[PDB]
Amino acid sequence: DIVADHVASYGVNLYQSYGPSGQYSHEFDGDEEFYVDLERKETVWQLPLFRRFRRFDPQFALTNIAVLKHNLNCVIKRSNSTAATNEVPEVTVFSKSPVTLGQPNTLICLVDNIFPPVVNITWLSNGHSVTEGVSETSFLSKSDHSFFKISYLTFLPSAEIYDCKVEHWGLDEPLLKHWEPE
Amino acid sequence: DIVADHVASYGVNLYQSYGPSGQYSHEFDGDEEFYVDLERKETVWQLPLFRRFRRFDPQFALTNIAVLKHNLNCVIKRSNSTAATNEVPEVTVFSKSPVTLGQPNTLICLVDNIFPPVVNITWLSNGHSVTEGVSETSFLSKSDHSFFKISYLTFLPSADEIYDCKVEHWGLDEPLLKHWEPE
Amino acid sequence: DIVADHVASYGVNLYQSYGPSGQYSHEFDGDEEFYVDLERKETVWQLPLFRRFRRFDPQFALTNIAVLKHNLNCVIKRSNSTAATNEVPEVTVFSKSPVTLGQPNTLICLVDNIFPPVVNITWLSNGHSVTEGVSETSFLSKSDHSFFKISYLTFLPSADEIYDCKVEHWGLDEPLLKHWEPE
Amino acid sequence: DIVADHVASYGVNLYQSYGPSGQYSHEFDGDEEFYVDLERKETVWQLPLFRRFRRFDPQFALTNIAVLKHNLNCVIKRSNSTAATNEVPEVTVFSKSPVTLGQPNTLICLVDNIFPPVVNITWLSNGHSVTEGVSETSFLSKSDHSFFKISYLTFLPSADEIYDCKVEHWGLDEPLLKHWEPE
Amino acid sequence: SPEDFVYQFKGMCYFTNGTERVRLVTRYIYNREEYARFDSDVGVYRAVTPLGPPAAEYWNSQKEVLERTRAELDTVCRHNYQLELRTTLQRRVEPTVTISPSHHNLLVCSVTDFYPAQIKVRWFRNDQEETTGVVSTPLIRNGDWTFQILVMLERGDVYTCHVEHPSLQNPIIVEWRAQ
Amino acid sequence: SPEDFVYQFKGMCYFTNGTERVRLVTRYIYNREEYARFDSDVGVYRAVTPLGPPAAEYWNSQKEVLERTRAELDTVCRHNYQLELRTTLQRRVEPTVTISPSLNHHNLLVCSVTDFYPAQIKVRWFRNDQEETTGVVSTPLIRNGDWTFQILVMLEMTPQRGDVYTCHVEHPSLQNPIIVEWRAQ
Amino acid sequence: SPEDFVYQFKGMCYFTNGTERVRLVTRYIYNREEYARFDSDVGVYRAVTPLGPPAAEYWNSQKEVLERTRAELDTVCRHNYQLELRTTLQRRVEPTVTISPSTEALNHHNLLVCSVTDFYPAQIKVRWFRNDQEETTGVVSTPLIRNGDWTFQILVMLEMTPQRGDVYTCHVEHPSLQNPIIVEWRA
Amino acid sequence: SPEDFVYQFKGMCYFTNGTERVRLVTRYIYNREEYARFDSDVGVYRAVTPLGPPAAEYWNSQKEVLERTRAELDTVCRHNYQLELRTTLQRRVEPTVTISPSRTEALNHHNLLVCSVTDFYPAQIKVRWFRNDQEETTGVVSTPLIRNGDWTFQILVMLEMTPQRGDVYTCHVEHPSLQNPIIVEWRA
Amino acid sequence: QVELGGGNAVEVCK
Amino acid sequence: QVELGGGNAVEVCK
Amino acid sequence: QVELGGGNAVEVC
Amino acid sequence: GQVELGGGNAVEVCK
Ligand SMILES: *[C@@H]1O[C@H](CO)[C@@H](O)[C@H](O)[C@H]1NC(C)=O
Numbered sequence A: 001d002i003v004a005d006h007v008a009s010y011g012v013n014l015y016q017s018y019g020p021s022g023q024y025s026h027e028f029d030g031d032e033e034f035y036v037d038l039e040r041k042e043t044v045w046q047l048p049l050f051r052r053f054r055r056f057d058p059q060f061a062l063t064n065i066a067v068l069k070h071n072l073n074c075v076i077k078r079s080n081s082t083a084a085t086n087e088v089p090e091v092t093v094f095s096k097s098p099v100t101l102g103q104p105n106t107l108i109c110l111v112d113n114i115f116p117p118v119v120n121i122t123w124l125s126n127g128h129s130v131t132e133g134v135s136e137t138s139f140l141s142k143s144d145h146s147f148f149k150i151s152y153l154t155f156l157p158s159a160e161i162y163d164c165k166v167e168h169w170g171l172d173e174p175l176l177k178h179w180e181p182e
Numbered sequence B, C, D: 001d002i003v004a005d006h007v008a009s010y011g012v013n014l015y016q017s018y019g020p021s022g023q024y025s026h027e028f029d030g031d032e033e034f035y036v037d038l039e040r041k042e043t044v045w046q047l048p049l050f051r052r053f054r055r056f057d058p059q060f061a062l063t064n065i066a067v068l069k070h071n072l073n074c075v076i077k078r079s080n081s082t083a084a085t086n087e088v089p090e091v092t093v094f095s096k097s098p099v100t101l102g103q104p105n106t107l108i109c110l111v112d113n114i115f116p117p118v119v120n121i122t123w124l125s126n127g128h129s130v131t132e133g134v135s136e137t138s139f140l141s142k143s144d145h146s147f148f149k150i151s152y153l154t155f156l157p158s159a160d161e162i163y164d165c166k167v168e169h170w171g172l173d174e175p176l177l178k179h180w181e182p183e
Numbered sequence E: 001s002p003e004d005f006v007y008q009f010k011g012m013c014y015f016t017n018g019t020e021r022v023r024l025v026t027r028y029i030y031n032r033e034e035y036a037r038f039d040s041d042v043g044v045y046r047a048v049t050p051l052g053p054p055a056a057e058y059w060n061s062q063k064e065v066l067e068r069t070r071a072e073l074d075t076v077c078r079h080n081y082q083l084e085l086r087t088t089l090q091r092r093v094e095p096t097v098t099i100s101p102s103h104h105n106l107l108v109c110s111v112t113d114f115y116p117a118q119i120k121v122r123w124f125r126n127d128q129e130e131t132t133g134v135v136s137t138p139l140i141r142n143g144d145w146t147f148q149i150l151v152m153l154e155r156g157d158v159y160t161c162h163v164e165h166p167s168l169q170n171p172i173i174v175e176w177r178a179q
Numbered sequence F: 001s002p003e004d005f006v007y008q009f010k011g012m013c014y015f016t017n018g019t020e021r022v023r024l025v026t027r028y029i030y031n032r033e034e035y036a037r038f039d040s041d042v043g044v045y046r047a048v049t050p051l052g053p054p055a056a057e058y059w060n061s062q063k064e065v066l067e068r069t070r071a072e073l074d075t076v077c078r079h080n081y082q083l084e085l086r087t088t089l090q091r092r093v094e095p096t097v098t099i100s101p102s103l104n105h106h107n108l109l110v111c112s113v114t115d116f117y118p119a120q121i122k123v124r125w126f127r128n129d130q131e132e133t134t135g136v137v138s139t140p141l142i143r144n145g146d147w148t149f150q151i152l153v154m155l156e157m158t159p160q161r162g163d164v165y166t167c168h169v170e171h172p173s174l175q176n177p178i179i180v181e182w183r184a185q
Numbered sequence G: 001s002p003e004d005f006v007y008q009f010k011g012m013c014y015f016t017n018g019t020e021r022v023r024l025v026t027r028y029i030y031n032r033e034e035y036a037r038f039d040s041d042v043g044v045y046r047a048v049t050p051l052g053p054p055a056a057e058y059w060n061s062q063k064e065v066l067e068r069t070r071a072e073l074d075t076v077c078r079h080n081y082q083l084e085l086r087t088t089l090q091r092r093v094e095p096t097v098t099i100s101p102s103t104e105a106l107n108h109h110n111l112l113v114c115s116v117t118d119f120y121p122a123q124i125k126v127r128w129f130r131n132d133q134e135e136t137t138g139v140v141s142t143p144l145i146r147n148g149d150w151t152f153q154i155l156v157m158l159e160m161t162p163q164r165g166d167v168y169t170c171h172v173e174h175p176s177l178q179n180p181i182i183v184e185w186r187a
Numbered sequence H: 001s002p003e004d005f006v007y008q009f010k011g012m013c014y015f016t017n018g019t020e021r022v023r024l025v026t027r028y029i030y031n032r033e034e035y036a037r038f039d040s041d042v043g044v045y046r047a048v049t050p051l052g053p054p055a056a057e058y059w060n061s062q063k064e065v066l067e068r069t070r071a072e073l074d075t076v077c078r079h080n081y082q083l084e085l086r087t088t089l090q091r092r093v094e095p096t097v098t099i100s101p102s103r104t105e106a107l108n109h110h111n112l113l114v115c116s117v118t119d120f121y122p123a124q125i126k127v128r129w130f131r132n133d134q135e136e137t138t139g140v141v142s143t144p145l146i147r148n149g150d151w152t153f154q155i156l157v158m159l160e161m162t163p164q165r166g167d168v169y170t171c172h173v174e175h176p177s178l179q180n181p182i183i184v185e186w187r188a
Numbered sequence I, J: 001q002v003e004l005g006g007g008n009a010v011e012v013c014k
Numbered sequence K: 001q002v003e004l005g006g007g008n009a010v011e012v013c
Numbered sequence L: 001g002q003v004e005l006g007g008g009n010a011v012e013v014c015k
């Protein structure tokens, strides 16, 4: 609705009841700049260029998240304990670079329309679960106040079929999306 | 949310300023039952079974749509002339039946998350634009108050014939092309 | 006279006196879609795609053909027994694909301006009559109410064998021979 | 000369010696957007749509018109006191809507080729001058640096009422009367 | 991109346990912002955004507009549902089953053109129901009152795709052996 | 007839293809003779008549006065066009189309397309279903002056048999062309 | 030569711009003389020759026979076209192009035959190109040959004199082709 | 299905023409419905749903909260943008262009060449196809801009071609991180 | 579906 | 029977 | 915003 | 590289 050359989110605050889960992150033009590890009191920048030339006090994140815990206990009293509505997530798998059946690559599993922000995104290579070479982003905010998460997988393309397994409350069964070398 | 065995929309009324175009349709479990041709004062049902056992006065659509034109001039006046936000439509092309080189089939182009409801959905077969055998649905409503449209293309699967779906929307920067061909 | 993008003939029914004989066929843009074998009560389509996905009840052909025989006894009585005028047919022989001595091909014998629809089209290979690999089309209609027939001959191009198309008609004085040989 | 999709006149400044009368108005595609009443310090918009979404500081008009009075005293001295040439105005009267007895309408009197901008436009109904239901526009600018004015008269078409437009200008020798009546 | 002003009205009925538990929710939507709604559980017009109080409170004062709409749960929702029971909810379309692949393991069982949406597809190796490796796509709505769903499954063995549907008295079984 | 001395100033903006091609021309006019003008395409003040060199060169000598005028291409022309984009450039008035005549004697059928905005409009006459390429007497576009227009399209015809004449009007304010019918006898 | 009596009937449909402009003409033909015909534009049975008034006026007197015939514009023409739209009007066969001289010699005038032999439908364009220069003269093209089995064929010849490095190409355009087919021939 | 209660807050800055036109909108969101927001153009806290009047009226009564929020347009939006101007808005990643057909190399059977322009930043990019230096304005199937999420983008521009002889197809890519356009060729 | 075609009209004979 | 739909409510407008 | 326009130029008098 | 800042959160009145 608000047209602008650049849109920044200096304060993506998130706090939920299901566990002590929280998140403080900044975003610029849709990409995540950093996220504050609330348990470690640590600002984790998402780029080598950011870690060297930018600074952010991690304590201000814990201050803001602590107010969320207070404000959450306030709207629950006003809304007569209205719980969250489980949304159906949309899963998409694609590669970062063209596949050459031998050149190292990175698989990308984008899980859109996530709500509430509680999800498990695990990889599968020929049935078996992959645990190494897997990394994911934090909960990136959307315009409709939902979230989407992206999981990465550095792999070796071989003539091996990979799957992305998403577990969410809005789904009845674990959703698997397929990807294979042409 | 509202859990229910069946969800019906007895009165999907829509009126916009651009056309100025409008639409009155009923839906049951997400499928379009009929739509009222506002120019001809004619109820056009979307199924042979509906045309035989159902009747709907088209005058109630023109009466109801005329109230929308009235209600529109006030929320624009109350919202200080707040225009619509152009959304990026999502295009997907797939076939209606399993493809068997020589057996007649039908291509389906689903254009999801349409807003505002102004779009061109045209087909392309081997570069050339298709004009015969193309039919589409009206604007079916979505839960987030957006729309989606589905266009059909009756075709004959051949070894050398590649089809495309051409979608033109304001939310897009250039006409979006989705490709489909029998492997 | 009548300009049109496509001209279809849904009902080229024909009934003759000699001796007796009839034919019912449909045509689209000059090509034969199917023909009903009136003796076998069977619809014989002229394309593999047509034989699998299209249907036509042959009984409507035998029903309509009986009306021609009925109407024929009316115009024969009203026109004071005006017989048919034998037309001189135009014969041309050509191949379906370029001929390369050894590659299977098909000879085509087009017999234009056929009237009345009574003709014998036989092939000749080195004098002798050919019996295997011979198929022909039905009487295809013309705008001037005449007919034309096309006979095919799948053959193996050799330096030997000089092939001929033998047409026997009442309008001709002797059987007309059109010659063909691999250059 | 300069072709354009839209031509706007953001600053139709006018000052003369006679009154001494002046005018500040804005125009878009030949129609008057507003005019500033220099004595009341009020921007008078000419449309309901303009009064709700637009604003203009009247002080910028009085500042600019005051410079005209300054710039005028120089060009009279530089041109050796070359006075204005009275042009002959052309008057035309027509109705806003098709004329139907009993149904309210509005008469329009166009006075073209006005120079200098000093004119009296009064209406006459069967001889006596009408004062109620009369409103007019300001001096609209022309490409040849002359002006034209439009006077309106809302009336009720009747069989026994004939209207006139009376124009008094220096370029004319006598008051010009243009006639209009329901044929 | 020319500006556009959109206004919508969607009188939606929610049916549960037949024509018994019926809920009517009429939504007045400006562009995509729903500003006023009527709820059968509430009984009156409620404002959803500050763009709605001037309209919801005016519609609650008039008894001819609030009584005509409260009765619409019976004259629109339950009235039209009696015709859905003889046409829509009676529609049976038999599904067209086709199995074809896209050392690995990827078998695509395409169950196409069926109505209604209730359907169960099961994979069977010889006669062993495959409870692992089943990649199923969500129900695809073709838009012509038919559906479509593709169920994937990741040494001489006969794999079969079993499709059960209300439009079928007996289950459809299609087999496919590796040549 | 008393003598009169008139002085005018017209700051005119020319828009093409939106805010992409904009040209500003301010005109300093004495009576009816324009003697000095500034052009955004040229960039400086130009003298147009011998009454202008003393004024054009004085306005070019001042650098803040030539800079204040050059910036008006953005602060006046392009600034107001964003305000025309929400009021004027969105104004759509649907035309009220009416057919009425001015028997075997030739007469004239007048299709009065009245009160419409903007100016782009196309009117066509139709006898039964044959577009009338002869006998169409159209008046030029009439500017009512109150942000509305009107045009009168006449048809010179003969009312014979049982033919239905229609007037088809196309206008941006219309989703479908407006059609008004008129039947003989 | 035995005498023969022929009777024909041709229910022909004429389509233009799709199913928008559709015209039905049934033709009652005796031998080669069409004596009575029905036209959807006319609306009734019309006699074309003096052999037709006794039949055309009788078929117009019965209201069930002309009403059943007037309705055939929808149950025969427009009904079958919906089935032609998914079978016949979708049939696309791309042509196989072959170049060969009609006797191969240098500096000796010859004729190059560009054989376009198996294509459908009838719309086709053939152009000759000598060294990427379109030969607008010396092109002898035969009319469209109807094979009769739902295929067409056309033979486009070029009058030329073979040289050293002249490269002739034959450009074929067809609705079944997104890009034109080009076949070359070197001396 | 376990119940969950989510609360979020989004302090968003909107930049146009640099720091000239900057707009601050803070959003207080309960579950998925934003119930209270502050707008720098408005100047005060606004209630968006009936869940907000008790919060909007309390936050406007305190004068230390309305001055702290109006100043956030300068201490957060314009303060961080001066830091984005030397790191993020200067980030230039050169795109890697690759041409390869989908179907295996056919003698003349139709094929489609996929020009994958992968890993580039920022998002502004223009790709054009050229058959023998003739810009293909028809038959070019381009995918929407893919956001990888690791500060890189990628777009795949496909061409529906027919492999003849000689045929030299090129994919022209222009990007702000490139002084001259990158061109990759492909011969039949 | 089932195709249809030109129904012939019967003439008064004998 | 004859099917029908929900009646829309008029806004304060003018 | 506030509409405006047409700045007039002063002459040497 | 100065000290970055962001969204100051507002506290709601609850017991
Ligand atoms: C596409 O839609 C626009 C309106 O959004 C219209 O102006 C244009 O003519 C359409 N293009 C085609 C090819 O139909």
Ligand SMILES: *[C@@H]1O[C@H](CO)[C@@H](O)[C@H](O)[C@H]1NC(C)=O
Pocket: D119, D120, D168, D169, D170
């Ligand atoms: C116009 O009216 C004024 C007085 O109102 C009068 O002095 C003047 O002479 C009139 N104009 C003409 C041309 O007579």
Ligand SMILES: *[C@@H]1O[C@H](CO)[C@@H](O)[C@H](O)[C@H]1NC(C)=O
Pocket: H017, H018, H019, H020
């Ligand atoms: C903003 O825009 C103005 C005029 O469009 C320009 O002069 C200025 O350089 C731009 N950038 C700023 C103010 O940072």
